[PDB]
């Protein structure tokens, strides 16, 4: 439930802000100020095609497409499990006794449906 919003939030709150601010300007612990400033400006300037708000949108779309392709095999496998006497095979009264509180008992329909299982 709501997987694409979680993907986009994870990207925009764990990669982009983490690689734009701290990976660029907080790397001055080893230092002069001018050299780390100029190399931060250089790595910021020669990067303006991957950290855009469109390329990460396409990346989240590709992530969702890959997870949907993975989800397809899982949905086909979990629908092709042991049937365990599934629905659309019993009568009305059997599934009504399964779901509880039928509010209308009728012995003739119980008889005509108990021979169908």
């Amino acid at each position: 439930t709501d997987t694409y919003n979680s993907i986009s939030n994870f990207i925009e709150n764990e990669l982009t802000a983490l690689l734009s601010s701290d990976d660029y300007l907080m790397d001055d612990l080893a230092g002069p100020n001018e050299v780390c400033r100029l190399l931060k400006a250089q790595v910021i300037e020669k990067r303006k095609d991957a950290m855009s708000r469109g390329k990460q949108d396409l990346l989240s779309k590709e992530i969702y497409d890959n997870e949907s392709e993975l989800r397809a095999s899982q949905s086909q496998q979990i629908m092709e499990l042991v049937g365990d006497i599934p629905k659309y095979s019993l009568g009305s009264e059997l599934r009504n006794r399964v779901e509880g509180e039928p509010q209308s008992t009728s012995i003739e329909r119980l008889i005509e449906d108990v021979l169908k299982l």
Partner: protein, 90 residues
Amino acid sequence: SEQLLHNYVSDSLLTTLISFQEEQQLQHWYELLQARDARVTSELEARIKQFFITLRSRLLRFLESEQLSHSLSLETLIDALYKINDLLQQ
């Protein structure tokens, strides 16, 4: 999936841009840059791998919730048949 995300996080980094242009101390200056930049991605690789774990586990526990509501068990059916047996006995 993970192969896209790791390639994306390893592409946009300092190690692919600064070391292209790389005298006695400055060679040792960016030598410590390559280890610290490899340190933060290793703390990042654990989070994105745990993110794919907590996604598919929450996904498959959702998929088994919708499937079992549209399937049947071998206990509630026997309980309903016990009730039907009691009614026909009466």
